Design a binder for this molecule. Structure first.
Ligand SMILES: [Br-]
Ligand SMILES: [Br-]
Ligand SMILES: [Br-]
Ligand SMILES: [Br-]
Length: 49
C-alpha cells in the first residue's frame, strides 16, 4: 500500500530485523517517487527468531 503523486521511479527495502514481540523477521519496503520522496509500501515477514 503506497502511491506516488505521479509515478514510482525506484525500489528499496530496509534490513531484516528481529521483531521482539512477534519473534519473526521483518523489514520495510520503500518506493522512490519521481519527485524524490520515498513511501512506505509494505512490511515483509520471514522466518522465526
Ligand atoms: Br504492497
Ligand atoms: Br512522483
Ligand atoms: Br535494497
Ligand atoms: Br535483508
Amino acid at each position: 500500500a503506497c502511491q506516488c503523486p505521479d509515478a514510482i521511479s525506484g525500489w528499496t527495502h530496509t534490513d531484516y530485523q528481529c521483531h521482539g514481540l512477534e519473534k519473526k523477521m521483518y523489514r520495510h519496503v520503500y518506493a522512490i517517487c519521481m519527485n524524490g520522496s520515498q513511501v512506505y509500501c509494505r512490511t515483509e515477514w520471514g522466518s522465526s527468531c
